[PDB]
Amino acid sequence: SKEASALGVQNIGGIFIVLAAGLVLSVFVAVGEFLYKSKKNAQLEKRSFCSAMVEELRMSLKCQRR
Amino acid sequence: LNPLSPDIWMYVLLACLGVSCVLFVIARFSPYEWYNPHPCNPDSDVVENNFTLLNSFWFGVGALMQQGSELMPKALSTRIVGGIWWFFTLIIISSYTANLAAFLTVERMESPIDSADDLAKQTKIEYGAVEDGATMTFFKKSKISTYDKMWAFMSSRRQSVLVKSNEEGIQRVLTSDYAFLMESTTIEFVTQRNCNLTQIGGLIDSKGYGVGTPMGSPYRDKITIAILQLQEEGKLHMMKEKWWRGNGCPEEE
Amino acid sequence: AFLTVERMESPIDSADDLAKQTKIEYGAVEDGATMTFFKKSKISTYDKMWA
Amino acid sequence: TLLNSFWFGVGALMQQGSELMPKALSTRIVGGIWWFFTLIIISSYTANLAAFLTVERMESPIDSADDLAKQTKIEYGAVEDGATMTFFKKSKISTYDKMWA
Amino acid sequence: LIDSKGYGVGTPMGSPYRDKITIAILQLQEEGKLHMMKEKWWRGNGCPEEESKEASALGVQNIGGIFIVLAAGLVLSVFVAVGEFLYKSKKNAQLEKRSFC
Amino acid sequence: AFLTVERMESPIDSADDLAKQTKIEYGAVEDGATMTFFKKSKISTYDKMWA
Numbered sequence: 001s002k003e004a005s006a007l008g009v010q011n012i013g014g015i016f017i018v019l020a021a022g023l024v025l026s027v028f029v030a031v032g033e034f035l036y037k038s039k040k041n042a043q044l045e046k047r048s049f050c051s052a053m054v055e056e057l058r059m060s061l062k063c064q065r066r
Numbered sequence: 067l068n069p070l071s072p073d074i075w076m077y078v079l080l081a082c083l084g085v086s087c088v089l090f091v092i093a094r095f096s097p098y099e100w101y102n103p104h105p106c107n108p109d110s111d112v113v114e115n116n117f118t119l120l121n122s123f124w125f126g127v128g129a130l131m132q133q134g135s136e137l138m139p140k141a142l143s144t145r146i147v148g149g150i151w152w153f154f155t156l157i158i159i160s161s162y163t164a165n166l167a168a169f170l171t172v173e174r175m176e177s178p179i180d181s182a183d184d185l186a187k188q189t190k191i192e193y194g195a196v197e198d199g200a201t202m203t204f205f206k207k208s209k210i211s212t213y214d215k216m217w218a219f220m221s222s223r224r225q226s227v228l229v230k231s232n233e234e235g236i237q238r239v240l241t242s243d244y245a246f247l248m249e250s251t252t253i254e255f256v257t258q259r260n261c262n263l264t265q266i267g268g269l270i271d272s273k274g275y276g277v278g279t280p281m282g283s284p285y286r287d288k289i290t291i292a293i294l295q296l297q298e299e300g301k302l303h304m305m306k307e308k309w310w311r312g313n314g315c316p317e318e319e
Numbered sequence: 320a321f322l323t324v325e326r327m328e329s330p331i332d333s334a335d336d337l338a339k340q341t342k343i344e345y346g347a348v349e350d351g352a353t354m355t356f357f358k359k360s361k362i363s364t365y366d367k368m369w370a
Numbered sequence: 371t372l373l374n375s376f377w378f379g380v381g382a383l384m385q386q387g388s389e390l391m392p393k394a395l396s397t398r399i400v401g402g403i404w405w406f407f408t409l410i411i412i413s414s415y416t417a418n419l420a421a422f423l424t425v426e427r428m429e430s431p432i433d434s435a436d437d438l439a440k441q442t443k444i445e446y447g448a449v450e451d452g453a454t455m456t457f458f459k460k461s462k463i464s465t466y467d468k469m470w471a
Numbered sequence: 472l473i474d475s476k477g478y479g480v481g482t483p484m485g486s487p488y489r490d491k492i493t494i495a496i497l498q499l500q501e502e503g504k505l506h507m508m509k510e511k512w513w514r515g516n517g518c519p520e521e522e523s524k525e526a527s528a529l530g531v532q533n534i535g536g537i538f539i540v541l542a543a544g545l546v547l548s549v550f551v552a553v554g555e556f557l558y559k560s561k562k563n564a565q566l567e568k569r570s571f572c
Numbered sequence: 573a574f575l576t577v578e579r580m581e582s583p584i585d586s587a588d589d590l591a592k593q594t595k596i597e598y599g600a601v602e603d604g605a606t607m608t609f610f611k612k613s614k615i616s617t618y619d620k621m622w623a
């Protein structure tokens with residue numbers, strides 16, 4: 001129902017796959033440095049669960065200014 | 067929009083909406099995006115998150131159009147998002163420059179049929195002619211090797227590639243890829259007053275229309291002196307501009 | 320430079336390009352109505368096919 | 371300002387950027403649609419100039435007698451006083467009269 | 472084609488060979504020997520057109536006018552450099568005397 | 573512009589592609605049985621070689 005005219009997924013669509021590979025790798029390194037800073041907090045703090053809760057309490061309010 | 071398919075266009079602005087919402091989450095999620103705005107500020111309760119849903123939409127469209135913004139993240143998890151999005155921008159625009167080059171380099175190469183010899187090979191474009199008579203029997207009585215091969219195409223294709231009237235032949239060109247053969251005068255009358263037609267090719271025959279007398283009539287030389295006067299004082303060519311040009315065509319526009 | 324040689328490809332449609340390219344080959348049942356036709360025709364394109 | 375708004379109207383077109391990049395929606399979209407405008411101009415200009423240097427379409431300066439009616443850069447002339455010349459002198463055609471001038 | 476006159480065989484006045492030659496040429500156009508002689512004494516060589524040569528390495532003959540509009544830019548820039556220079560010297564001169572100072 | 577003229581012009585594949593461009597010199601010993609074939613051939617693809 002075609003031959004080709006104008007650069008479809010059959011031509012260019014693999015650039016979205018390496019885009020999809022980028023976003024998935026970005027979230028995986030998002031939690032990678034998240035518990036790292038929770039360990040960088042844990043030099044003076046306690047166990048990094050409730051310290052990460054403050055690191056997730058700050059995500060909840062969405063207007064921090066603190 | 068023609069150098070790209072609209073299936074690409076309908077996703078890529080949604081992908082810009084897609085990369086806007088994803089980067090806005092990670093910016094709120096990461097701790098390395100909270101430095102000091104106005105860095106002279108000597109305190110702790112001043113942490114910034116200049117990333118907004120407005121700004122995450124803005125960094126997408128600002129980077130996609132190859133211009134820049136003022137967003138400039140610091141966290142690696144927010145930098146890899148813009149990093150691959152920069153690698154997606156460079157492809158989709160250089161491909162857009164490629165295919166827009168591709169249309170304009172093949173349309174300029176596209177040369178139509180020009181001469182009678184150019185129609186000698188193309189059996190895709192069908193000749194035809196007018197009704198059996200003046201234009202036709204020149205081809206039949208010819209011995210020219212080009213025009214003989216034209217008659218062979220018309221020999222195999224009786225019953226309506228060979229139409230029987232002028233305006234029917236005008237109608238057959240205007241619908242299909244038909245290429246009508248005709249007396250070169252009445253082509254100038256239709257092409258002037260259609261602006262959808264063109265006289266392709268030159269002039270095959272060189273016969274002419276005359277005044278004419280009966281046999282041995284003594285008015286003939288008096289009319290032979292007449293027309294041969296009309297061409298110097300130009301009233302004959304002035305009447306060629308009288309009854310032929312009526313509209314003009316936007317080919318010059 | 321890729322998308323311009325890919326455009327001009329004619330996945331041959333009518334017999335006229337099929338009359339030009341002698342790389343790809345024609346075909347007919349021998350001594351059929353087809354050999355009867357393209358011999359006894361005089362058409363410019365089809366005479367190149369008979370040659 | 372009136373200088374800077376003109377200054378954003380050039381550096382954005384020239385693929386360079388500036389330091390004006392706004393925050394209110396009313397001035398964002400004007401900057402947004404200009405940024406979509408500036409790739410359709412330049413890349414097509416890159417496409418068309420790449421379209422000239424490949425498949426050259428040779429053209430003549432004049433095409434008709436009317437095209438030579440205005441160009442006094444290209445000079446007419448003719449043959450010796452006689453057959454071709456005296457047609458132009460004895461004519462009353464408004465095109466060919468200007469050729470005789 | 473501007474004019475449409477033609478070359479003929481021609482006779483003296485009242486010569487009776489004229490109609491016999493009028494029947495002659497008007498026979499020659501159907502059997503095509505008249506047009507065959509137009510292909511006899513006119514075509515001798517033929518003309519070529521080929522090879523689609525690339526415009527290798529654009530010179531001044533191609534691109535060099537971009538330096539002229541560059542040269543037009545620098546000269547206009549120095550002219551408006553002194554244009555605002557004495558303007559600010561006048562903007563100083565609502566506090567200042569002897570504007571050469 | 574360089575890369576769109578060096579890729580349209582394919583290398584020498586067969587007598588079809590070798591007929592169109594004339595930059596590559598056609599090969600013929602003068603007055604041979606090979607040249608006898610191409611002077612009397614009727615396929616225009618082979619006659620464009622002869623032309």
Ligand SMILES: *[C@@H]1O[C@H](CO)[C@@H](O[C@@H]2O[C@H](CO)[C@@H](O)[C@H](O)[C@H]2NC(C)=O)[C@H](O)[C@H]1NC(C)=O
Pocket residue numbers: 240241242243
């Ligand atoms: C060029 O334009 C013509 C006219 O618009 C197109 O001609 C069509 O041809 C088909 C063939 O049977 C007819 O059924 C249509 O009715 C024609 N169109 C019209 C408006 O009459 C043609 O398709 C166009 N393209 C090409 C490549 O020739």
Ligand SMILES: *[C@@H]1O[C@H](CO)[C@@H](O)[C@H](O)[C@H]1NC(C)=O
Pocket residue numbers: 240260261262
């Ligand atoms: C011919 O041109 C006229 C005027 O431009 C237009 O109205 C008409 O549709 C054209 N013919 C076809 C078949 O499109």
